[PDB]
Amino acid sequence: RTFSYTLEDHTKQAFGIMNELRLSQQLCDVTLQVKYQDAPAAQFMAHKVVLASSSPVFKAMFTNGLREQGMEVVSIEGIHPKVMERLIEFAYTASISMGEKCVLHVMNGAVMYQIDSVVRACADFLV
Amino acid sequence: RTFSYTLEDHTKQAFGIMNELRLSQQLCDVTLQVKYQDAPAAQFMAHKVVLASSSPVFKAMFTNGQGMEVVSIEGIHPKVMERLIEFAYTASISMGEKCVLHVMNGAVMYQIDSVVRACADFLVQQL
Ligand SMILES: *[C@H](CC(=O)OC)C(=O)OC
Ligand SMILES: *[C@H](CC(=O)OC)C(=O)OC
Numbered sequence: 001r002t003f004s005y006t007l008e009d010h011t012k013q014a015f016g017i018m019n020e021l022r023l024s025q026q027l028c029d030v031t032l033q034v035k036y037q038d039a040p041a042a043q044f045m046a047h048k049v050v051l052a053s054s055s056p057v058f059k060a061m062f063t064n065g066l067r068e069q070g071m072e073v074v075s076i077e078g079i080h081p082k083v084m085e086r087l088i089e090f091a092y093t094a095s096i097s098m099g100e101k102c103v104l105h106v107m108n109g110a111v112m113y114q115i116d117s118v119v120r121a122c123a124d125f126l127v
Numbered sequence: 128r129t130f131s132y133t134l135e136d137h138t139k140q141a142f143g144i145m146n147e148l149r150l151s152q153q154l155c156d157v158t159l160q161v162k163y164q165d166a167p168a169a170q171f172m173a174h175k176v177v178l179a180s181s182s183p184v185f186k187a188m189f190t191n192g193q194g195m196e197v198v199s200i201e202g203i204h205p206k207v208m209e210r211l212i213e214f215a216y217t218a219s220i221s222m223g224e225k226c227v228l229h230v231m232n233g234a235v236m237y238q239i240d241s242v243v244r245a246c247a248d249f250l251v252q253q254l
Contacts, residue, residue, distance in 0.1 A: 001224035005245040010218035011138035014180035026190045027176045029156070047176045049154040053141035063153050070194045094137035100128035121132040 042081035054091035146216035169205035
């Protein structure tokens with residue numbers, strides 16, 4: 001015989017504690033310090049492989065070129081730090097929430113990182 | 128207003144992506160050297176944050192006292208460790224009726240309860 005088993009919500013629960021390691025700052029190999037014009041500078045430590053799984057350009061930033069081992073500090077410009085936080089959380093919890101006055105900026109931030117499931121969610125909200 | 132959105136198929140897609148990354152040895156920080164009793168020694172590369180997301184033992188291992196790490200693994204077979212690692216990235220596992228005990232023992236070593244309870248429920252069928 002051949003017995004097979006598939007835990008359905010495993011990916012839901014596995015992502016649940018990958019978010020714990022991000023908040024507890026464990027196993028992190030990238031630090032996204034993002035500074036925006038007329039905005040307080042911020043820092044978000046995350047995991048390269050889990051951000052690569054949610055964004056093709058996050059995947060491209062970390063897979064090619066000469067990357068720093070251990071932990072790589074990445075300077076990011078162009079998006080507000082309060083928008084990058086919305087994107088990183090979506091990459092860890094598969095959900096995103098905000099007010100009606102920021103869905104435009106979050107859409108532009110999600111287009112740059114090609115998180116297409118968010119650019120279509122922000123588009124369906126504005127219709 | 129308040130915008131909210133949850134992509135349901137996200138965690139399934141993201142795991143399929145970082146499964147492609149482990150099959151191409153990108154963004155990996157582990158080399159699991161499996162040394163069993165007179166078995167052909169095999170090696171498996173994976174991510175600390177992914178193995179920690181599916182195994183409490185792997186979480187306690189990688190979160191203690193950086194960079195790339197090579198860990199020796201003994202007491203487990205390469206093919207049952209390979210099946211456990213594939214479960215971490217695919218949430219699925221498949222064995223033969225003659226290998227259900229050697230995988231339940233491998234899963235009980237790393238406290239992957241979902242695989243343990245499934246294999247233990249298989250043995251009570253023929254009992
Ligand atoms: C928007 C802030 C936000 O999205 O809160 C969830 C913003 O930064 O204004 C430009
Ligand atoms: C081998 C099953 C086994 O008993 O190894 C511990 C196997 O099915 O490989 C796919």
